[PDB]
Design a protein around this nucleic acid. Structure first.
Ligand SMILES: [Mg+2]
Ligand SMILES: [Mg+2]
Ligand SMILES: [Mg+2]
Lengths: 1208, 501
RNA sequence: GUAAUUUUUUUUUUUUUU
RNA sequence: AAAAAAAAAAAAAAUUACU
């Protein structure tokens, strides 16, 4: 009757009775809130105050539950906590609180006359408490708390843990919940007004703290230290106190690692291989031990004194490097609440986007060639930091200038507009001219360009944009400020397109720009893993504090001098509305005017650099229109990241030439830069490496940047990835399973499960217990997302219910709301979670009819069509090949509920919904709009690539339109026209069409089978022979290289068997990723690769037309052909499966690494594709069954029908 | 084929001094291009304002080498129509597309013509001082050819082989067109009309030309007059067309004045200036502020006070105006006061020229620590010695911009703009681009240029001429032209073009 | 556990003053 | 018929995530 007393809680297996029991107990928690209130606040939970247990490293710790008085008895709302200026035009200049202050919920009353300043301030302060706090990822917040508490109960088989008393001592105020969230009003309603204003967020803090316990990061006694620390910050203002101690509670680990003294660590080769292990010293240099003094004093007075004694204990009780790594993982969970930090955008404005002026002022360069209006066409630096940066950068201006000449910049701008982002707002006079449907789609950059295509070559288009304001728009992020961003219109975004195109070319001439976290696996940290394995090396992960605001108007000129140099050496006619022509010009030394030939790239860059207005504007409900001060880099632009990257690498690499011309050597080996992230690695003498690092920091101060120097001997950070002595420390708190930033819970069904699957995958190699991460996600899919609510027409309400009730349980609502249709929830079976095209979640052992169980599927278990095998696996494949039958045992699959689960998948509800939405898109308007965009770039090569697609489709091969480059313009205008929400007339057509398919499918539903399913009929037998471990198993037994890869664990053993990444495969992936613009991460599952590889194997002689259809130039044709040639060594088309790079972070991508572990009889090789096929069968089985792998060799058996399907 | 049809907009070309020859192979060609314009505009209107194949259009018109004939039919219906028209011309080549090098001319080109320029090689006619050269091939054959009458040239139209059908008259005699027309027999000739002036002065380095937006009668100046006489009219309406530094100074005299074409204001200027007039007029904006940067010695205070009255009279509201020395003169008095006053009427009373600035006191004692006391000692230094002193003056400026303290620059402008009794409209002047982060939160900052050699107005003055020249060089080194450049005649033109109520 | 909310217009009745 | 206040019915415009 209780979740911790179930038999699934003691066996962790799915029998026909354990499964039906957990199914009914979890559906009871998802439907009604009386059961949830009963589950969370039952009187059987005895409150505990004193606790004692082991810390994260096995030492004894004692804690006491402490809830401050300011949370139980909050104060009255003080109106002086949010002051205003004497003009009342904005908030006060220096105001203490940018976030929600802790006060009594009912203490905030709005007793002012409407349309008044103090009325607006209170109508907005009300939205801060009731609207900016409801941020849930999957479901209601009380449902998400039930999911965390259910898993903590089923895992520990008890209820006496400290997190239960926190839940009861915080939210149990009466016989109902203190507050709820109404999805209709999009608001949080308070039932108890005598409650703290900040409590709705602490429901997420409990979710996050319980998530770290399931993860192995925190223990039960450490959950007290963590919850006591969070409640201590909420005494005055939660978010303001957390941001103020975020770094001080984390930067202690470098001192704790120094005191360890020695460490045995793995050693990395240059080619991404662990080649040995060594014992080194972890003592820091003398200039690092000097910062231990100032940091000791800051912790002693700013930190919660119970939290400080945990750090002092972590710092004295650590004996190995694995000790510091475990204590450090806990202090991230103690200082990161897990939520996304949100407030009023007027309150975070001055702290996020206001310009700031650091050490030194940056001076101008000498103008050499000027305009008729005295606007610099060409300049040069006399001295300073501009002279130092250009000494390195001016040596790329000739090679870049010729790469720019070989680009069609008008077609490049049309591909840059792959964004459906707003820009501005249409005008009614303008709106009337286009008419109807078109204006409904104008929230996109590609559609605003199509409407105004008549004036693309008109120069007045530019000047009209200097009259429009830059709309400010902000985003959220965990553990940081709000950081408003600028949204430019298509015209101001155009003036930044040539400075972007120019500075992007230098990425091809250096190796000091980080590609990013493109690969998604350990290939991103491959350089750090190597350089942190060397000796006599100094590691510098230096950070520019608020670079976006620190860039002043004269600092931007250092990049202008670079762009204007390139533009003057190129020959570009007809860029936008510009053309090359003779121009009257002023020169230095000469007294009258000259005449020069200025090309189009020079005219665009020269106009942009001399008309710079960076101030953004936010329209506030309180103050009207609010404008920023001038100077902050807009950061919504084409060249916002290439500017920071080019400016920083010219200062670091130019200081290398400055020191050489002064008689000083450089100890600098590599630098990696991405935006404002810098990573410097010096190797050499101790005083030589310190000398070079100090002058590098001093040249950054001379450029008006403030920065803190965190130098280390044995740790380095880049892009939120910490590497310490050849070991990766993951940041598990940076991933919120329970909160999200966008107020659009995309993924109404079967796509939220893809979002949860993608979030669990990111957590595996940054967590200490991935098996507790599986129990968590299982209960999230069983409680948070198990209902599917849609509105059904009343004339079909009883027909859909009576027909669907035979497979699944449905919920209905009020009979008559006095409307046409009423809404109807749908409760899907638990078996839906583990099914393909459904939940696709790792399963627990199901019980077969003969009494044996299936495999306990791990976190490395593949998805896709591979999940279909579980249907035959519970049907005893082993017994199935003995009888030579291919049958499903439909009776047993019905008891668990797979028949009802697979039926719901066959309705294809989401696909069905999008068909009624595209019926309202008029293709006459999409084609007319696409016709006018084609007159802007290249005059052709859309029809040509479209015809190549159709002349391809006439044969066996038919590409999807998103792949074809000729439909690139349409596919966006479809997205632009489909971005609209569903209307009420469309909900009827959905209900009508959904009703037709239910009476069509539910007649006699049997689980269907294809002939290709014979490939699933294979098994394995355990021999008595122990396979040998790879030699890098000894090298990883000291100081494991991930939190989930400790010695003896399942992630450690999978490395000792399969090995590490395939260096040759990841290299060919980084190439095919750099061929696609506006493309973050490429995987071998991508449509262009999968569709192109399918023809490369079937009909290679048609591969040229494929290249014309996708518009692959000779460079990308070689990059794709080179990857098709390698993937064919191990790839397969017939047996599809899906692994993620974040999932196999350190593990091998190539299935062939598993053929040394399995023995296959040579009589089974009956076809040319058998070898690659059998390598997959064993590669997927060893990753799925890794929890019971004791290191024995396997023998493969095959169904006689599998052999028949392969022969032909 | 001109980019703007001269048969329709004949008054536009008359502004440049271009009068159509009366009504030949050239008479036939200007009629043909007028038919192509009407056809192109009719075709563009039928697909959302765009031509469907701008490359086929450009090749048929400008090269004359393409024929489209029906023997799909709906996609080439417009190109078949343009084809039979151009066949009927029977030209030996194609019509070249002609453009001027004027910003005003380029702003009036139709949209469909701009779509052709990407697929043609246009013939761009240059302009010297806003006037296209009449010696061009196409300008000589299509329009009348001007004949400039001067004082050493005044004679009957018979002394030269002038015909009223081929020549227009540019009267530069200084006398009325009515006396010239009747006392010398030019009754049948067409005179060109210029509304501006073009003055030539004597400079320190040579001779300086200046274009003024006033008539030679309105501007009361003749040959030999002084630069200081009628100075405010030159400053409000004049733009010097030389490279900076020009040699203009208070010792310049006029060598020559002539009627000239009147200048057009820039488009990027009128856009940023009308972006400021939106905030003045709107009710969704509480405080409006225009920041104006200029070089030290440009004469921006004398102008921006008149600009502020003309804005107050047109908008009907009160306009405040802080000088560029407002903060330094306040800081000189209240640097030791613990709780100084930030009232607008108190700050406004310190903004007089008799109050010394804080930055002038520090640069005075700085120039003494190096031994500089006169302008002649300063001009003798090398560039590296000067730059080494400006770096020490940059340390005095950074200390007032780095934080937001009681006496900081950011707090000063905050407590002044957000005051209860401060005007709603403010015009603040600045010195260098780093004050972007301190002066009021705005969306419109401009850089003002005048007719002034700023280094010459600083060394030809009194009241500490060496500190004034030193600070001019220090600020110049911190103020590039990275914000939109405006002129006094453009800032006054924006007020007139705005529709008040 | 739904389909509401801002401001503006028109006609429809209610009550108050001339 | 001059106005004010509320009730019903219909129309108008209207919340927003840059690179
Ligand atoms: Mg960093
Ligand atoms: Mg930064
Ligand atoms: Mg950063």
């Amino acid at each position: 009757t209780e979740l911790y007393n179930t038999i699934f809680s003691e066996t962790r297996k799915f029998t026909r009775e354990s499964f039906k029991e957990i199914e009914h107990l979890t559906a009871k928690l998802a439907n009604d809130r009386v059961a949830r209130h009963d589950f969370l606040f039952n009187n059987s939970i005895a409150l505990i105050s004193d606790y004692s247990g082991e810390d994260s490293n096995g030492n004894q710790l004692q804690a006491t539950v402490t809830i401050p008085n300011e949370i139980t008895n909050p104060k009255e709302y003080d109106p002086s906590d949010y002051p205003l200026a004497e003009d009342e035009s904005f908030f006060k200049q220096g105001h203490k609180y940018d976030y929600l202050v802790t006060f009594r919920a009912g203490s905030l009353t709005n007793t002012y006359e409407p349309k008044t300043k103090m009325y607006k301030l209170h109508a907005a302060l009300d939205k801060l408490m009731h609207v900016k706090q409801r941020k849930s990822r999957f479901a209601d917040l009380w449902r998400e708390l039930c999911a965390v508490i259910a898993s903590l109960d089923v895992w520990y088989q008890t209820t006496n843990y400290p997190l239960r008393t926190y839940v009861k001592l915080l939210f149990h105020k009466g016989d109902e919940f203190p507050f709820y969230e109404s999805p209709s009003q999009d608001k949080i309603i308070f039932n108890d007004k005598s409650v703290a204003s900040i409590l709705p967020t602490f429901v997420y803090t409990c979710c996050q703290v319980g998530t770290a316990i399931m993860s192995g990061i925190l223990t039960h006694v450490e959950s007290i230290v963590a919850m006591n620390h969070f409640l201590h910050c909420a005494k005055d203002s939660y978010i303001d106190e957390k941001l103020k101690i975020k770094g001080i509670g984390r930067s202690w680990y470098q001192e704790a690692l120094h005191n360890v003294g020695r460490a045995t660590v793995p050693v990395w080769s240059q080619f991404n291989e662990v080649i040995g292990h060594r014992t080194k010293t972890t003592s820091e240099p003398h200039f690092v031990s000097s910062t231990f003094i100032s940091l000791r004093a800051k912790r002693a007075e700013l930190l919660y004194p119970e939290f400080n004694e945990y750090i002092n204990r972590a710092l004295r009780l650590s004996k190995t490097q694995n000790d510091v790594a475990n204590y450090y993982a806990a202090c991230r969970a103690m200082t990161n609440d897990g939520t996304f930090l949100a407030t009023l955008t007027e309150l975070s404005l001055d702290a996020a986007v206001f310009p700031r002026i650091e050490q030194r002022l940056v001076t101008r360069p000498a103008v050499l060639m000027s305009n008729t209006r005295h606007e610099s066409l060409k300049q040069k630096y006399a001295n300073g930091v501009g002279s130092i940066a250009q000494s390195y950068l001016s040596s790329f201006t000739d090679e870049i200038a010729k790469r720019v000449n070989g680009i069609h910049h008008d077609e490049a701008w049309l591909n840059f507009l792959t964004t459906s982002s707003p820009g501005r707002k249409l005008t009614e006079i303008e709106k009337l001219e286009v008419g109807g449907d078109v204006a409904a789609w104008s929230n996109s950059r590609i559609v605003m360009q199509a409407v105004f295509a008549r004036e693309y070559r008109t120069p007045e288009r530019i000047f009209k944009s200097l009259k429009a304001p830059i709309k400010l728009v902000e985003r959220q992020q965990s553990d940081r400020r709000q950081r408003a961003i600028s949204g430019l219109d298509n015209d101001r975004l155009f003036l930044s397109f040539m400075p972007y195109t120019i500075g992007k070319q230098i990425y091809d001439l250096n190796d000091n720009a980080a590609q990013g976290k493109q690969a998604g696996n350990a290939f991103d940290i491959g350089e750090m893993l190597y350089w942190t394995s060397q000796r006599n090396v100094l590691l510098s992960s230096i950070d520019v504090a608020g670079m976006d605001a620190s860039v002043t108007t004269n600092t931007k000129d250092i990049y202008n001098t670079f762009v204007l140099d390139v533009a003057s050496k190129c020959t570009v006619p007809r860029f936008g509305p510009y053309y090359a022509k003779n121009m009257e010009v002023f020169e230095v030394g000469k007294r009258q005017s000259q005449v020069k030939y200025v090309n189009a790239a020079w005219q665009a860059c020269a106009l942009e650099a001399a008309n710079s207005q960076t101030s953004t504007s936010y329209e506030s409900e309180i103050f009207g229109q609010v404008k920023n001060a001038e100077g902050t880099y807009p950061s919504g632009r084409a060249d916002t990241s290439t500017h920071h990257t080019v400016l920083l690498q010219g200062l670091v690499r130019g200081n290398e030439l400055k020191r050489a011309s002064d008689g000083k050597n450089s100890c600098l080996t590599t630098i990696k830069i991405l935006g404002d992230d810098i990573m410097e690695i010096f190797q050499g003498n101790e005083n030589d490496t310190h000398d070079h690092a100090v002058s590098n920091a001093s040249i950054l101060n001379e450029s008006g940047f403030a920065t803190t120097a965190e130098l280390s001997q044995n740790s380095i950070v880049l892009l939120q990835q910490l590497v310490v002595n050849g070991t990766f420390w993951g940041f598990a708190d940076r991933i919120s399973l329970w909160t999200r930033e966008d107020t659009k819970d995309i993924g109404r069904l079967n796509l939220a499960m893809m979002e949860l699957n993608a979030l669990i995958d990111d957590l595996l190699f940054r967590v200490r217990r991935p098996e507790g991460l599986k129990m968590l996600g299982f209960f999230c899919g069983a409680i948070c997302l198990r209902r599917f609510t849609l509105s059904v027409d009343n004339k079909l309400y009883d027909s859909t219910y009576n027909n669907l009730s035979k497979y699944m349980t449905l919920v209905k609502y009020d009979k008559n709301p006095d409307f046409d249709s009423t809404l109807m929830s749908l409760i899907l079976p638990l078996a839906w979670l583990f099914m393909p095209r459904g939940g696709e979640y790792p399963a627990y052992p199901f019980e077969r009819r003969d009494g044996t169980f299936t495999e306990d599927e791990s976190m490395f278990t593949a998805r896709g069509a591979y999940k279909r095998r579980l249907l035959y696996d519970v049907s005893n494949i082993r017994e199935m090949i003995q009888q030579n039958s291919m049958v499903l045992d439909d009776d047993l699959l019905h008891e668990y509920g797979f028949t009802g689960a697979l039926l719901l998948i066959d309705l294809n509800i989401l696909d069905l919904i999008d068909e009624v939405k595209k019926e309202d898109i008029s293709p006459v308007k999409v084609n007319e709009l696409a016709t006018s965009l084609e007159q802007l770039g290249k005059l052709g090569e859309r029809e040509k690539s479209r015809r190549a697609a159709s002349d391809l489709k006439i044969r066996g091969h038919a590409l999807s339109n998103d792949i074809v480059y000729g439909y690139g313009l349409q596919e966006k205008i479809q997205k632009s026209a489909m971005a609209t929400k569903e209307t009420t007339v469309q909900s009827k057509r959905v209900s009508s069409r959904l009703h037709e398919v239910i009476v069509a499918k539910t007649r006699d539903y049997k689980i269907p089978t294809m002939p290709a399913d014979a490939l699933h009929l294979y098994e394995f037998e355990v021999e008595d022979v122990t396979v040998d471990l790879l030699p890098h198993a000894k090298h990883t037994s000291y100081s494991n290289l991930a939190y989930n890869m400790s010695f003896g664990s399942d992630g450690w053993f999978a490395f000792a068997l399969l090995g590490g990444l395939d260096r040759s495969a990841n290299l060919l992936r980084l190439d095919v990723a750099s061929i696609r613009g506006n493309y973050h991460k490429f995987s071998y599952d991508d449509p262009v690769f999968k569709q192109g590889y399918k023809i490369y194997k079937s009909d290679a002689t048609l591969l040229n037309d494929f290249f014309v259809a996708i518009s692959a130039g000779p460079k990308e044709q070689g990059i794709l052909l080179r990857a098709f040639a390698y993937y064919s060594l191990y790839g397969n088309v017939e047996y599809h499966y899906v692994l993620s790079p974040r999932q196999l972070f350190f593990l091998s991508d190539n299935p062939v690494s598993a053929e040394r572990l399995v023995r296959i009889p040579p009589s089974y090789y009956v076809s040319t594709q058998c070898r690659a096929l059998y390598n997959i069968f064993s590669y997927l089985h060893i990753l799925r069954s890794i929890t019971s792998n004791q290191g024995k060799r396997l023998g493969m058996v095959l169904h006689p029908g599998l052999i028949a399907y392969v022969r032909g | 084929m001109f980019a703007i049809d001269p048969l329709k907009h004949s008054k536009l070309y008359e502004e440049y001094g271009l009068y159509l020859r009366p009504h030949a192979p050239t008479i036939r060609s200007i009629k043909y291009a007028s038919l192509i314009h009407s056809m192109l505009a009719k075709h563009a209107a039928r697909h959302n304002g765009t031509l469907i194949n701008p490359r086929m259009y450009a090749d048929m018109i400008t090269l004359g080498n393409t024929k489209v004939t029906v023997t799909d039919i709906v996609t080439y219906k417009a190109l078949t129509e343009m084809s039979t028209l151009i066949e009927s011309f029977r030209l030996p080549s194609g019509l070249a597309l002609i453009i001027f090098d004027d910003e005003k001319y380029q702003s009036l080109i139709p949209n469909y013509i701009n779509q052709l320029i990407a697929y043609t090689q246009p013939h761009i006619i240059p302009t010297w001082q806003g006037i296209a050269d009449f010696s061009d091939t196409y300008l000589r054959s299509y329009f009348k050819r001007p004949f400039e009458l001067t004082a050493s040239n005044l004679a009957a139209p018979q002394k030269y082989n002038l015909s009223p059908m081929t020549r227009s008259i540019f009267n530069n005699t200084g006398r009325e067109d009515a006396v010239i027309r009747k006392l010398y027999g030019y009754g049948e000739y067409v005179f060109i009309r210029y509304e501006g002036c073009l003055i030539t002065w004597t400079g320190i380095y040579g001779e300086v030309t200046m274009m003024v937006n006033l008539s030679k009668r309105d501007l009361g100046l003749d040959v030999g007059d002084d630069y200081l006489k009628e100075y405010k009219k030159l400053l409000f309406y004049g733009v010097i067309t030389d490279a900076i530094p020009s040699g203009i100074s208070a010792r310049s005299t006029i060598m020559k004045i002539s009627p000239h074409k009147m200048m057009n204001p820039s488009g990027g200027a009128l856009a940023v200036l009308s972006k400021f007039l939106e905030a003045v007029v709107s009710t969704n904006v509480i405080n409006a502020t225009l920041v104006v940067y200029a070089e030290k010695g440009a004469g921006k205070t004398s102008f921006l006070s008149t600009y502020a009255e003309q804005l107050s009279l047109a908008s009907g509201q009160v306009v405040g105006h802080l000088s560029s020395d407002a903060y330094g003169r306040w800081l000189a008095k209240n640097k030791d006061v613990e709780e100084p006053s930030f009232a607008y009427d108190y700050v406004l009373s310190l903004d007089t020229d008799d109050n010394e600035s804080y930055y002038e006191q520090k640069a005075s004692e700085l120039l003494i620590s190096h031994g500089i006391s006169e302008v002649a000692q300063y001009e003798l230094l090398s560039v590296r010695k000067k730059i080494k002193m400006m770096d020490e003056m940059n340390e005095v400026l950074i200390a007032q911009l780095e934080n937001a303290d009681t006496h900081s620059e950011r707090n000063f402008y905050y407590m002044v703009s957000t005051g209860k009794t401060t005007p709603r409209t403010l015009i603040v002047e600045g010195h260098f681009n780093a004050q972007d982060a301190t002066i009021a939160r705005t969306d419109t900052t401009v850089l003002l240029r005048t007719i002034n050699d700023t280094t010459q107005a600083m060394r030809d003055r009194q009241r500490g001429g060496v500190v004034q020249l030193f600070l001019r060089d220090t600020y110049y080194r911190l103020l590039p032209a990275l914000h939109t450049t405006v002129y006094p005649f453009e800032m006054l033109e924006s007020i007139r073009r705005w529709k008040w109520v």
